[PDB]
Design a binder for this molecule. Structure first.
Ligand SMILES: [Zn+2]
Ligand SMILES: [Zn+2]
Ligand SMILES: [Zn+2]
Length: 572
């Protein structure tokens, strides 16, 4: 029961029993917490509760020290000192932001704003608290029981009454009963088990609620600037392909950590892999939150780095299929590609943390705790999508509040900025450069004259809350007949239910804006589906239209974003 204060690091035995994470609070900070919040239970070796038999006084403000035991006003002996007095709570070794983090329900944007603008120790307390709150919320949903099996990819479900039903998308991964993880897509539903198993009627599925481990390491280590490249040995034979990044690679070796803002198709993975060719003897750990982000780094490394010095770290509880071309689980290899949650306890000369807009402060801290590195490089784009905040329902989360790295990129600017988009037709580059990049993103490609926009509100229907716009899909169908080259397009929308409908009607491969991030396609057909905060979100809009290498058709619901698209308008 001996530890350090979360607010001022002062030593104490005084924890808070009312906080879900039980934080240690010193005498002054414990007082300022109990006297300003509903939190009145204070912990130590023995709790601050009335020692009198059958007494339920647990409020520290109503308790006193009577010799060596604690009693309320009704049971205290004549010679007794109040536990709360002179701005302190009695304890051994004798805050407005801490209070708000400790007592919020995490459903408001303002809660995440505070969790990212607070001191470093409060950022870890907010991250631990938020994650535990998100996990305790998983218990609220209702069990789905297999009532009948139709085919190898379709079934019918029986839901638990009294408990709400979770949205059926690839975002929520169920746990079948321990017969492997399972996913669902919309009474006939589509079943996708991570393990091929003959779906048993009667067997139940439940959401994976995991124990939230405490955070020790900061989200960002303290910054260090050096006069020379430190612990890294550069080449004087750096391939012309990577010469554009030489000054930035040198910046990487001259700072403890560095941030790289790379808009879509500006060369983030090329920069990340080229850093290995610039410091050829450096041990590099390549990390990201998702298996897809890690796999995209493996694909680029397969092209430039020796396959014998690479290893893809895969957790024993293999959830989805990932990169098979490197030797699996050899932690000792020079190049290690691994998701944040599967990182081993190891050291590195450089740690590259990619798709940083998708990281949370919990992820930032975990990386600093498992990896001890000479240099840390954070690659991503605050103008792209953040990790979904399942508890957040009120207010919008701005990019400067996604995590510590994004906060820095949006306030002091990033250390490095990749300014030339090599992927997209100029119509798309010009639109997103003006929309989210302050006119600093330049187009390498010419205009393709294959970027179209149509303003069509259609009809909005809902599959629970996930939206569908059948008339917008009908407009796509009509366009496809007149433009058969577009037969090869990927259909993108902000909603899985819109995508399920488009899949059956158009036969195009489908992708939500959020699952399309990091991917690129020659042709993209995007239907906005609705005018909601979700479908009008400028970061989501940015990702959506920057997936296209050659052409894009945007069927829009919002006049604002439609007018901003620098595309040829279509009629019908
Ligand atoms: Zn304190
Ligand atoms: Zn508390
Ligand atoms: Zn009492």
């Amino acid at each position: 029961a001996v530890g350090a204060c979360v607010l001022c690091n002062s030593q104490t035995s005084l924890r808070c029993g009312a906080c879900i994470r039980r934080p240690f609070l010193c005498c002054k900070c414990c007082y300022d917490h109990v006297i300003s919040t509903s939190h009145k239970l204070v912990l130590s070796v023995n709790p601050y509760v009335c020692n009198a038999p059958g007494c339920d006084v647990t409020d520290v403000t109503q308790l006193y020290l009577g010799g060596m035991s604690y009693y309320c006003k009704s049971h205290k002996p004549p010679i007794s000192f109040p536990l709360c007095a002179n701005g302190q709570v009695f304890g051994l070794y004798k805050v407005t932001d801490f209070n708000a983090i400790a007592t919020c329900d995490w459903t408001n944007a303002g809660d995440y704003i505070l969790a990212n603008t607070c001191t470093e120790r409060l950022k870890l307390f907010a991250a631990e608290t938020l994650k535990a709150t998100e996990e305790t919320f998983k218990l609220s949903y209702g069990i789905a029981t297999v009532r009948e099996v139709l085919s190898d990819r379709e079934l019918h479900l029986s839901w638990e009454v009294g408990k709400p039903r979770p949205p059926l998308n690839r975002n929520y991964v169920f746990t079948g009963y321990q017969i492997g993880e399972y996913t669902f897509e919309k009474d006939a539903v589509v079943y996708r088990g991570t393990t091929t198993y003959k779906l048993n009627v009667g067997d139940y599925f439940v959401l994976t609620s995991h124990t939230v481990m405490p955070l020790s390491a900061p989200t960002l280590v303290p910054q260090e600037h050096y006069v020379r490249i430190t612990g890294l040995y550069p080449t004087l034979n750096i391939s012309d392909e990577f010469s554009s990044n030489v000054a930035n690679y040198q910046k990487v070796g001259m700072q403890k950590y560095s941030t790289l803002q790379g808009p879509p198709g500006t060369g983030k993975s090329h920069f990340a892999i080229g850093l290995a060719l610039y410091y050829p003897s450096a041990r590099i750990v390549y990390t990201a939150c998702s298996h897809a982000a890690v796999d995209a780094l493996c694909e680029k490394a397969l092209k430039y780095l020796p396959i014998d010095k690479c290893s893809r770290i895969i957790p024993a509880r293999a959830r989805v299929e990932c990169f098979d071309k490197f030797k699996v689980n050899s932690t000792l290899e020079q190049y290690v590609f691994c998701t944040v949650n599967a990182l081993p306890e190891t050291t590195a000369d450089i740690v590259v943390f990619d798709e940083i807009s998708m990281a949370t402060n919990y992820d930032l801290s975990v990386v600093n705790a498992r990896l001890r590195a000479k240099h840390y490089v954070y690659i991503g784009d605050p103008a792209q999508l953040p990790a979904p905040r399942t508890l957040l329902t009120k207010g919008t989360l701005e990019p400067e509040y996604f995590n510590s790295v994004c906060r820095l990129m949006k306030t002091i600017g990033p250390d490095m900025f990749l300014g030339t988009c090599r992927r997209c037709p100029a119509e798309i580059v010009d639109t997103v450069s003006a929309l989210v990049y302050d006119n600093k993103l330049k187009a390498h490609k010419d205009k393709s004259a294959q970027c179209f926009k149509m303003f069509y509100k259609g009809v909005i229907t809902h599959d629970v809350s996930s939206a569908i716009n059948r008339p917008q899909i009908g407009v796509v169908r009509e366009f496809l007949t007149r433009n058969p080259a577009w037969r090869k397009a990927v259909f993108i929308s902000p909603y899985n239910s819109q995508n399920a409908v488009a899949s059956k009607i158009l036969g195009l491969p489908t992708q939500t804006v959020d699952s399309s991030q990091g991917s690129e396609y020659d042709y993209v057909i995007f239907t906005q589906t609705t005018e909601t905060a979700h479908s009008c979100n400028v970061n989501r809009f940015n990702v959506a239209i920057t997936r296209a290498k050659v052409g894009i058709l945007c069927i829009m619901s919002d006049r604002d974003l439609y007018d901003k698209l620098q595309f040829t308008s279509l009629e019908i």
